[PDB]
Amino acid sequence: EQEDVLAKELEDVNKWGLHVFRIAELSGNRPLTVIMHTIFQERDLLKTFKIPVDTLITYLMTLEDHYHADVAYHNNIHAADVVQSTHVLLSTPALEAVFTDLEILAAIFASAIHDVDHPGVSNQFLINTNSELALMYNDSSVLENHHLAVGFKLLQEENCDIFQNLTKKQRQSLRKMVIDIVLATDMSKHMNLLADLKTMVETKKVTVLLLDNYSDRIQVLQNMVHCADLSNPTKPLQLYRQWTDRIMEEFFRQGDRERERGMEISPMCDKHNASVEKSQVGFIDYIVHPLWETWADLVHPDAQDILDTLEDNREWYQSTIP
Numbered sequence: 001e002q003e004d005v006l007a008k009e010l011e012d013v014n015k016w017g018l019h020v021f022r023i024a025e026l027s028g029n030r031p032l033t034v035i036m037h038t039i040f041q042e043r044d045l046l047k048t049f050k051i052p053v054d055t056l057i058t059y060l061m062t063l064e065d066h067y068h069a070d071v072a073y074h075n076n077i078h079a080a081d082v083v084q085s086t087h088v089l090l091s092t093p094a095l096e097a098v099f100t101d102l103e104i105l106a107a108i109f110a111s112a113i114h115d116v117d118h119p120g121v122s123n124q125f126l127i128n129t130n131s132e133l134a135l136m137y138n139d140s141s142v143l144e145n146h147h148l149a150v151g152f153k154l155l156q157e158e159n160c161d162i163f164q165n166l167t168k169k170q171r172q173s174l175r176k177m178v179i180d181i182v183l184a185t186d187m188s189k190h191m192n193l194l195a196d197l198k199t200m201v202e203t204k205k206v207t208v209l210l211l212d213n214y215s216d217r218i219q220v221l222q223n224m225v226h227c228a229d230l231s232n233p234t235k236p237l238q239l240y241r242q243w244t245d246r247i248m249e250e251f252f253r254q255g256d257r258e259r260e261r262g263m264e265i266s267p268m269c270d271k272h273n274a275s276v277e278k279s280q281v282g283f284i285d286y287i288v289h290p291l292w293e294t295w296a297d298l299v300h301p302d303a304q305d306i307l308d309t310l311e312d313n314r315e316w317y318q319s320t321i322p
């Protein structure tokens with residue numbers, strides 16, 4: 001009877017503001033797994049890419065296992081969330097039939113792994129602490145590079161290769177795409193990504209959106225997953241505040257070590273100069289709203305509803321200030 005109620009909630013997989021935490025619990029902490037499975041089913045991807053179902057579950061389960069249950073934000077639930085968000089984003093009327101099946105798969109898949117094996121501290125933290133990871137990747141997109149490496153390496157476990165029936169050309173192309181996307185989730189590439197998104201809205205054409213070259217398509221996709229990645233101030237409030245509590249719990253833990261090692265405690269990593277609300281408003285006025293406002297223009301007027309809520313949410317966090 002608890003698979004019934006989970007089935008009931010999964011009917012919302014096409015809606016923005018899906019109850020993803022309820023889904024987490026109602027599935028035995030298998031949100032990324034059930035949610036990926038429902039999306040592939042809904043989009044017919046198993047049939048299109050001849051992915052055996054046995055193979056699909058194994059893989060998602062192993063992937064999901066490689067999210068850390070003990071980091072509050074960058075876990076399987078967040079992974080589940082971005083995935084589902086990108087999926088809805090994919091479906092916006094203004095993108096109808098712009099993207100191939102294989103382009104679609106990359107964006108969903110990449111969303112699925114974009115933070116796999118995240119340790120719960122930031123790139124900058126890992127660079128500062130001369131960490132084993134940061135030494136590996138020469139201080140450059142340290143974590144993103146990592147999530148990709150892990151996401152790809154898992155395909156190699158017994159009965160995990162969900163790409164086995166793609167052609168060689170298909171595999172090359174999807175590998176590149178997934179790499180180009182996950183790497184674009186590095187928060188220091190934000191300003192440049194967005195500036196590029198702004199030129200594209202500046203010189204866009206319609207028919208529905210028109211793009212005739214890899215580099216225009218991959219950009220849109222990268223920004224789409226960036227949006228999904230940075231999509232939680234745009235969900236209904238009860239959801240977004242839980243996400244805040246969480247990332248904040250993760251940061252405070254970082255700064256407990258940042259203050260412990262004795263570096264200068266990051267900005268907004270100090271549980272004693274917590275300005276949580278002030279920091280969402282700022283995060284929205286300078287990062288999230290500029291971003292979404294822009295995406296909403298590319299797909300005018302499909303994202304209108306998402307942008308409204310965003311502004312209801314901000315106007316709420318502000319109400320909590322003085």
Ligand SMILES: CCn1nc(-c2ccccc2)c(C(C)=O)c(Nc2ccc(C(=O)O)cc2)c1=O
Nearest residue numbers: 122123185186187232233243244247268279283
């Ligand atoms: C709950 C919503 N929220 N809030 C903040 C936010 C928090 C405090 C101050 C300023 C911003 C952040 C941040 C810090 O950027 C969110 N997401 C992130 C995305 C990417 C990275 C990254 O290291 O690559 C980190 C976090 C976020 O989801």
Ligand SMILES: [Mg+2]
Nearest residue numbers: 114115143185
């Ligand atoms: Mg990330």
Ligand SMILES: [Zn+2]
Nearest residue numbers: 078114115229
């Ligand atoms: Zn993320």
